[PDB]
Amino acid sequence: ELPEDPRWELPRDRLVLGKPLGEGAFGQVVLAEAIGLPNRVTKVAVKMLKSDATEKDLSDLISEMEMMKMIGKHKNIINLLGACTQDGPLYVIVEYASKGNLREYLQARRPPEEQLSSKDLVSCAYQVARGMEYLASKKCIHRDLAARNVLVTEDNVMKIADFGLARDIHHIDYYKKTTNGRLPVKWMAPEALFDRIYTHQSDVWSFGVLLWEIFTLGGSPYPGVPVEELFKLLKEGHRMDKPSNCTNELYMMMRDCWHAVPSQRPTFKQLVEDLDRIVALTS
Ligand SMILES: Cc1c[nH]c(/C=C2\C(=O)Nc3ccccc32)c1CCC(=O)O
């Protein structure tokens, strides 16, 4: 069925499958221990299909894997480690982020899981801008950059997930909610949300939204605002308010990421330099 790839295959007996991770946002993922990769076990996350999965589901998953193979490694993205593709279920072994996604990570450290500093937060921004910059350099458009799609390792390293995901943009239901109850269209740039044009620029728009979340510690964008009301806000050029406990400088960065004209938004290469500078000057 699946063609062999000596470059990534791992014997099945080397992957001790463990407890399910998450509630199903990134599909069916489980924690596991990979022996070898010979006498050391490495905790990894394993992506697999469900029993009632369709051949389409199989295709897309294969597509996501081949995508991760072409893109290459980077500290700030979820990296592919191997795969079990022969004589059995397709197992995609990727890096494990023990602390889960960023949204919940940020929420869990809000003052009434210890509190994060201004530098810790600006450092989160930096790391994500860096994962994105590399992804952009590799010709990859994410299409759904949000705190929920950023995972945190036990060492607090921010990693972008879902970047190699397979998706027909001309099939996206604007009313479908995230598992947490939010509307993904709230992270979309106007041109993407309206004209279905995804570019590194629309990803930058999303980064502005992700920055907002960081500085509101898991804040939900546009609370109570439904899809049709959102369109109207965007049509009228509406921009979210500056989070309290946020410098004017970082709000301006958010505002620049949300520039009306795509060509005028900063690049990830630019944001990385700006964030690198800010982090150093941050208490
Ligand atoms: C708590 C937690 C720890 N790890 C994870 C998930 C993942 C993980 O650790 N590595 C991955 C690679 C790709 C997709 C998901 C994961 C969760 C769940 C995160 C979630 O579903 O939002």
257 lines ligand 1 (CB under 6 A): no
Amino acid in the structure at residue 7 = R
Q: Two tokens at 216?
A: 């509101």
Using the CB atoms, write b or e for 257-280: b if 16+ within 10 Å: bbbeebeebbebeebbebbeebbe
Ligand 1 atom closest to the Cα of residue 24 is 21
Residue 145 near residue 184 (C-beta atoms within 8 A): no
Which positions ≥6 away from 132 have C-beta within 8 Å? Answer: 76, 142, 145, 160, 203, 207, 268
Residue 152 near residue 186 (C-beta atoms within 8 A): no
Amino acid in the structure at residue 208 = G
Q: Two tokens at 70?
A: 């072409």
What is the SS3 assignment for 247?
Answer: coil
Rounded to the nearest angstrom, the distance between the alpha carbon of 256 and the centre of ligand 1 is 30
Task: Report the distance separating Cα 267 and Cα 127, nearest Å.
Answer: 15
The residue whose CA is least distant from atom 5 of ligand 1 is 100
φ, ψ for residue 65 (rounded to 5)? -65, -50
Task: Report the distance separating Cα 215 and Cα 200, nearest Å.
Answer: 23
Helices (H) and strands (E) in the chain, counts: 8, 7
What's the CATH number for 97-280? 1.10.510.10
Task: Report the distance separating Cα 156 and Cα 56, nearest Å.
Answer: 35
Ligand 1 atom closest to the Cα of residue 97 is 9
68 lines ligand 1 (CB under 6 A): no
In terms of Cβ atoms closer than 10 Å to its own Cβ (0-12, 13-18, 19+), residue 79 is middle
DSSP state of 213: H
Rounded to the nearest angstrom, the distance between the alpha carbon of 61 and the centre of ligand 1 is 16
Residue by residue, DSSP assigns 87-126 as SS--EEEE---TT-BHHHHHHTTS---PPPPHHHHHHHHH
Give the active site residues.
Answer: 144
- Domain 2-96 homologous superfamily, CATH: Phosphorylase Kinase; domain 1 (3.30.200.20)
Please indicate the experimental technique that yielded this structure.
Answer: X-ray
What angle (nearest 5°) sits at the alpha carbon of residue 201, between those of residues 195 and 205?
Answer: 85
What angle (nearest 5°) sits at the alpha carbon of residue 156, between those of residues 154 and 162?
Answer: 90
What is the resolution in angstroms?
2.5
Which positions ≥6 away from 249 have C-beta within 8 Å? Answer: 278
Give the domain ranges of the chain: 2-96, 97-280
Distance linking the first and last C-alpha atoms of the chain? 55
DSSP state of 151: E
The residue whose CA is least distant from atom 3 of ligand 1 is 100
Rounded to the nearest angstrom, the distance between the alpha carbon of 24 and the centre of ligand 1 is 9
Task: Report the distance separating Cα 68 and Cα 162, nearest Å.
Answer: 10
Amino acid in the structure at residue 238 = H
